[PDB]
Amino acid sequence: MEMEKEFEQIDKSGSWAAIYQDIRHEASDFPSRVAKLPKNKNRNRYRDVSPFDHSRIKLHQEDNDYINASLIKMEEAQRSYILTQGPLPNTVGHFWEMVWEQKSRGVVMLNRVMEKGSLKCAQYWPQKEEKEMIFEDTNLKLTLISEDIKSYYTVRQLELENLTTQETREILHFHYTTWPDFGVPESPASFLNFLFKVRESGSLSPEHGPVVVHCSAGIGRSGTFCLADTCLLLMDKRKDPSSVDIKKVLLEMRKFRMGLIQTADQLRFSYLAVIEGAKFIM
Ligand SMILES: CSc1nnc(NC(=O)c2ccco2)s1
């Protein structure tokens, strides 16, 4: 079926939970043996969210190459994304090592450091120009260059320096600051505006390594972001845009990381975002 009318048909019939459970039943199951090794317990935020072995990002290290991060490679859309958990106190250096080694231009953050009165990820970037951060375990230095605070999101320019080689690179930090502590946004308008700002920066384009996207677990809000982006790109590329099947795209993405889209409300919100976004594109 088309999307917008499949949408009203699920709303009128109140069957979002049944649609979402079908997706969960059909989703791929692949091994995640490296994630479950005892030496990696303090590298995982949640025991039930792990990267598959076949698609995990490897750190360029001989001691321990593990990080909770996956490469999502979308062949028809010609887009790639790295989806990862929010960094932990003992993985902030690994996180920036990955950004460096994978040649990423942008980092997309979809959570606040504290939500619901608890910490959802480490404070992993500097908050003042004159107070830089040094990650001694991976030999990197990170400096805040500039910050632009808007009503729904903040954009930061950061300098990452590889202290071994003295090479430097400019990284863009795109921080969506207004996702509610509970539920999903009422309108997709500010989320779509944010996605378009990431696109306009070049961070999603083939001349750079894959964008790094995270929330707390790296599967819910993060899954919504890449699902919406890929579906809108396919609607631009194909002769028949009504052929784009958001459930099929989501199952393809779940071949590369488990659990993408965590609730039926996130599934409904993803439909809403793609539907509204397709009208603005034209
Ligand atoms: C204010 S001067 C300074 N503080 N901290 C530095 N290094 C780190 O904060 C760090 C490494 C891993 C997590 O935090 S340089």
From Swiss-Prot:
Positions of post-translational Cysteine persulfide modification: C215
EC class: hydrolase
The reaction(s) this protein catalyses: O-phospho-L-tyrosyl-[protein] + H2O = L-tyrosyl-[protein] + phosphate
Annotated compartments: Endoplasmic reticulum membrane
Modified residues (Phosphotyrosine): Y20, Y66
One GO CC annotation: protein-containing complex
Modified residues (S-nitrosocysteine): C215
One Gene Ontology biological process: positive regulation of IRE1-mediated unfolded protein response
Phosphoserine, modified sites: S50, S242, S243
Tissue expression remark: Expressed in keratinocytes (at protein level).
Every Tyrosine-protein phosphatase domain range: 3-277
Active site: C215
Binding site for substrate: D181, C215, S216, A217, G218, I219, G220, R221, Q262
Linked residues for N,N-(cysteine-1,S-diyl)serine (Cys-Ser): C215-S216
GO molecular function, one term: protein kinase binding
Residue positions, PTM Cysteine sulfenic acid (-SOH): C215
Residues recorded with modification N-acetylmethionine: M1
PTM entry text: Oxidized on Cys-215; the Cys-SOH formed in response to redox signaling reacts with the alpha-amido of the following residue to form a sulfenamide cross-link, triggering a conformational change that inhibits substrate binding and activity. The active site can be restored by reduction. Ser-50 is the major site of phosphorylation as compared to Ser-242 and Ser-243. Activated by phosphorylation at Ser-50.
Cysteine sulfinic acid (-SO2H): modified positions: C215
Its EC number(s): 3.1.3.48
Tree of life domain: Eukaryota
Assembly and interaction partners: Interacts with EPHA3 (phosphorylated); dephosphorylates EPHA3 and may regulate its trafficking and function. Interacts with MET. Interacts with NCK1.
Sequence similarity: Belongs to the protein-tyrosine phosphatase family. Non-receptor class 1 subfamily.
Name recorded for this polypeptide: Tyrosine-protein phosphatase non-receptor type 1
Organism: Homo sapiens
Origin organism lineage: Eukaryota, Metazoa, Chordata, Craniata, Vertebrata
